């Protein structure tokens, strides 16, 4: 009929604009920051220099981990992502995410903290999958610790499983945006995870696996991904 | 009302492949760049720095331009971009471009010349769209033409149409790649020529390419009246 197949034509456009829109905003918004603080280094003679240059990197690196999202949630969609399961030493891989995070936590005014045992061991999944899992969980963490604040990485092995935790001291989730936490392109007051918390969610769902968040606006949050041992 | 709503949604998801692969294929280059050489200035003490900042500057600007092309690409590609018909001055149109892109000819140590007559007078099109595609073509015409060379933006009106020329006596395009010119990826930024035949075909003309390789390049708008 007329109506019906207007209706999904209609249906077909919307869900096309608002992909393509969300996608903007979140290739837009770091542009801003980079062109901003540069032209501030072009007219520049330091430590007030590098606050802009660390500016500049902050938000080209946000732009880059928007666009490996979008790409890492297609080759997903798509039934394409396949893991590279061998074992993995959990201190290491939280020790990692520190390192690479330790930059814009500075810039942040933020501290970073490790809280794994040596008793926790080994895991079997795939390293590079878990180690993007903790980094979409710290740049989250770190985007709603104010300055002064603390974000930790933990692991623990226990009840026949082994969970990472990201906890922060920042802002907690609004009650009304926890259930949509781990949706795509879901708007946050804050700033936009975008298809962080979605990659999140399907990454650790892909190990057999499942995610939480804890939150209460003045106790701040924590993220843990729950991976199940193998026998 | 199965069929028609599935067909609808696998359309839409072609387009959404596209984008999202144009915005990986286009950004990431100049991502690393900017990456990079902030590294570099941010463990940094100067005369070293000044040419980290300049790389920043270029990969930024070429950012810029770059997620501008990914956006009006898939703008067209949807056809959710309608222009806004107008009379547009040839002669204060290719002065605009010549001024705008002043600035980079100069660093690249080129000559930007403007040859119109007032014989050509006032045609029909959207400004800004117009205005997109000369800067396209003359910022091509810049990376192509070696320093002390020169660019050339003219108009003529002849035979029931008014043509823009964008001249270069750059390196010239071999024959091959001349029929697929305005195809994009088919080489820095790959969607800058598929915009101008775009645009120039929405505005019911067609783009052509007159190129002797040793000699030179010029691209042609051939927009009737």
Known sequence: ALADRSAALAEAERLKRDFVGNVS???????????????????????????????????????????????????????????????????????????????????????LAVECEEDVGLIRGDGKRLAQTLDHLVENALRQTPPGGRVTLSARRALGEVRLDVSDTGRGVPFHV????????????????GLGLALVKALVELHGGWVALESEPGNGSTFTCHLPETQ
């Open 25 to 111: 905003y979140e290739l837009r918004t770091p542009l801003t920051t980079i062109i901003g603080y540069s032209e501030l280094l072009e007219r520049a003679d330091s430590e007030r220099g590098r606050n802009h240059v660390a500016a500049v990197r902050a938000a080209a690196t946000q732009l880059a981990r928007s666009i490996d999202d979008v790409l890492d949630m297609a080759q997903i969609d798509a039934g394409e992502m396949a893991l590279e399961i061998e074992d993995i030493r959990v201190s290491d891989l939280l020790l990692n995410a520190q390192e690479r995070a330790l930059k814009d936590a500075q810039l942040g005014g933020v501290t």
């Open 178 to 193: 926890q259930a949509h936490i781990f949706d795509r392109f879901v708007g946050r007051d804050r700033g936009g995870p």
